[PDB]
């Protein structure tokens, strides 16, 4: 009786009202494109004073729902295919030419051995390798990071979503928005929530991380765009909701393999027409854009069905009162 | 009685026959690779007459189940790290050197201020910035699009699918197909449905869009490959089905942030051995290849189970006739 | 009675114990980054002796949960925008200048026709096209593959997973691992299962494929990282499990469109400051990193619920004994 009343207020309140069992349900199809904007300034020894724009710091220039911003670098310039001393390690160091077998090439060595034992320094000797030479120096990445200015960059996240079942199509560039707004706006929770242009700093900040620490060794940042919509409500809700979360760094007590980095090169022909190359070991933050969402709308079918499934339990309450 | 007959013809006709409840069900594992083929010809002022092949128009040259074809460009050549006037805006324009604070660098400005107010034109003056100079001119992208010839390009979409539960493996390159066929064929609904090489024009066309309009500002095109298979039927069905849909452009009344474009650069060392750079703001169509599918096959287990679940409702019909 | 005992030992043994119906269930959120390491050596006619490092063989240098390693190439150097004979085909060959309509450009031709019929050889004549010239020669890719040394490369697969429902975060770089270990280790089943650095050779090998065959025409390799965890057990299990599978090559009887390859270019300005280009048709193996997993943990709610659903069937056994 109070059991009846409980499970009857349950198959209406819980499952019909609260769990939206009067609704058909579809899940989102999404597409995103991104654009980063900004300049960073570096002074190092020696490129002189250097500026990095979007075509300098986004590697590759286009990905599907992901973007990588360069933050720190170690740059080795004027490399050519030639011979040089390996960088000194237990594995590399040597006393005589005998220590170095010609042709020996192991995954963690600087190249293919000549092999000759040659001076790496005044003090140390090392196997001579055929490689892109000079080798990249062995150093920690700059702190503060070279590309620190990246914190002030902005990224337009453009997102088209569709809900096939409902013939529903929307963009995260909302109808109350227009071109001029995008000429100025930068997303803020308080004053500009509808601006789909985010300061990178703000993204990692809102995830409770510090851009200028992260930009040293790099990392991975998630951007979740959630479109959860009641289409029984007007089409004016069904707006996306952004949340930001740092994706790497699972056991932060660890100094083991921190951050994100990769090597890439730029190639040139010099005077003689022999390839010379610039190698960059870049650190940066990969930004993963992930889109989710579910749209309900009223249909009688799952309502009836859910009610039918509801009475089956609601009566079996009073049935199991006796049936034990 | 007619209620019985109705819900009994239901647990056979609806759920056992029509809804394939006699079947185990697995979902597809897929892998795709793509290849674009074609040349486009441009004449502009002034590169001279120029040809663009696959290595020119596909950025980057390889992605996982996505490919981007360049369609329109704005090209700024001979850039060097140097000083120049910002492009004139409310934000950039100035009267005195005082208007420009040295070092000021905002995300939407052309570079880092010197700062000096310098002539942009006869009429206007603008903050001098340290940047890649000259700056990209401010213009609309060419209509007709530079790379219009891209409409005639072809793309081989190669797709390997597998169904783990059924030990089932197939390719969208069908057994009735062979090498010569691929030497000539281009996919058509009527004469060549089994040719997995598609004219780009035909893809966007079949989605009811116009290539030569889209190629102006760019866009995103979906290609859905659906493998839905009854493996009780011979392995000769279980063929993929292609449908094409334009992914961006949710509220087409909008002039706000239309299409798809990105900036990318090519780098050179000049005589003096100082980096000079070509910058392209490219527009194009990203093609997203999306693969789905479900394979059923006969198993007794879910058949029995579904029947058992069927009688429970079929009898409870006659039970709720009285039980109200 | 033995029916009762059977279906009661079933709703405990099968569904409560074996199917873990006492458990809440969440599925994995994952992020991966990768790093390839190694040098390959080539001798060909004629680049001289050549070394390929990570920045040479990984195209593009960064992808999201995928990496492509170059294995074989066909390299055409010193290309310029200029006129040359098309490569001889039924489509290309000709007798008179009339055979070649100026401006004719079809997707499978080498360029835009001048059109002039010009000597391709002593024996054959072919339409002159405006193209990047000389054209890439028509040949099979080298066997053995140029980049065979790639078999010995290593790849660090770094994987961060999270389970939102359980506030659970882990990395595939396990707590019992540290920096030095990564300085030396290479994953083996027997001696080094916890080393997340894999020899490429071993990956394709363990999938029962032969690296030096695959590296000729290229291919697609899957790497599945499965995190399936009982969090009722200590956090010390909940380790990932790696399995490797070749993704392409569905109907291996086929010589039709085998492997994986793409064209890409490197651009240079020569003396005169006219663009010259190197074109590579590269073959290689794309490595797809795919992460899955499910975590259960004890909650009373689905336990009670499952038991309630269990008695409904357990009694209806004895009910349908009579009710037929
Ligand atoms: C293009 O799209 C834009 C974004 O949707 C539009 O901007 C929006 O425009 C409306 C008005 O056009 C803004 O409305 C607000 O109204 C409040 C009260 O206004 C009242 O003032 C009158 C005085 O004469 C009075 O008679 C009436 O009562 C009238 O209604 C204002 O107080 C309010 O100002 C502030 O409001 C928010 C703070 O809570 C904040 O969102 C606003 O931020 C905006 O301005 C600052 C700079 O001024 C920037 O930092 C932001 O980037 C942003 O532009 C502001 O601080 C405001 O006037 C509404 O705020 C505004 N939305 C935003 C966020 O801009 C444009 O109208 C569209 N343009 C065209 C051509 O249609
Ligand atoms: C490699 O793989 C290819 C694709 O599967 C194969 O091509 C297929 O080959 C068969 C025959 O080998 C084609 O069969 C069709 O048969 C019809 C009737 O043929 C009859 O003709 C005889 C006359 O002597 C008669 O005795 C018999 O009755 C015999 O059966 C033909 O009418 C038909 O022609 C048209 O059929 C379709 C139109 O509805 C259309 O698909 C065809 O398109 C093809 O041809 C045009 C150019 O001619 C191209 O635009 C297309 O690209 C395509 O090649 C054609 O218009 C046809 O002969 C079957 O059509 C064909 N499939 C396709 C699509 O090519 C090759 O046989 C394989 N090669 C090898 C070495 O095995
Ligand atoms: C950083 O992280 C590393 C990986 O977790 C750690 O390495 C691990 O360290 C422990 C010991 O520190 C290794 O433990 C094993 O213990 C066995 C028995 O040891 C016994 O020997 C004593 C003799 O005085 C005796 O008193 C005690 O009974 C003592 O317990 C050893 O037999 C065993 O050797 C072999 O064990 C495995 C074979 O079944 C195999 O995994 C090992 O491989 C390792 O060594 C070879 C080269 O020697 C390499 O090819 C591998 O790459 C690997 O390094 C070995 O063959 C071993 O000592 C445990 O094996 C080891 N794990 C691995 C895989 O290295 C480091 O300790 C951490 N470093 C720091 C600073 O903490
Ligand atoms: N294929 C690979 C990739 C990584 N490493 C090693 O794995 C450890 C951590 O990876 P990572 O953080 O990426 O190394 P880095 O600090 O960037 O150093 P390295 O320049 O050697 O990659 C390093 O000792 C690195 O040398 C390796 O030996 N084999
Ligand atoms: N990080 C970004 C990216 C975009 N934009 C602005 O967002 C608007 C629309 O984006 P998009 O269509 O990509 O701009 P474009 O027409 O290509 O112009 P722009 O060259 O400035 O990117 C433009 O006013 C653009 O300048 C911005 O201010 N901040
Ligand atoms: N857009 C495309 C892509 C592929 N092909 C043709 O499809 C067949 C097989 O594809 P693939 O294995 O990638 O060709 P390749 O052997 O690499 O030859 P090609 O250099 O012509 O691409 C070849 O005859 C290729 O020329 C084509 O005509 N149109
Ligand atoms: C480039 O390398 C050469 C030797 O290969 C060396 O002499 C010189 O330092 C480098 N040139 C420049 C531009 O510094
Ligand atoms: C490149 O820039 C210089 C000045 O930096 C200018 O004199 C010239 O127009 C450019 N050279 C070419 C190739 O046009
Ligand atoms: C580059 O091409 C020119 C003609 O365009 C040719 O003379 C020469 O073989 C090439 N130069 C080199 C570096 O071999």
Numbering used by the authors:
A (entry chain A), B (entry chain A), C (entry chain A): 36 to 359
From the paper:
P2X receptors are trimeric cation channels that permeate a wide range of monovalent and divalent cations, by responding to extracellular ATP345. In the P2X receptors, each subunit has two transmembrane helices, connected by a relatively large extracellular domain. Seven subtypes of P2X receptors, named P2X1 to P2X7, are widely expressed in excitable and non-excitable cells, and are involved in diverse physiological processes such as muscle contraction, nociception, taste signal transduction and macrophage activation. While P2X receptors lack affinities for GTP and UTP, some P2X receptors have weak affinity for CTP (20 to 50 of times lower affinity than for ATP).
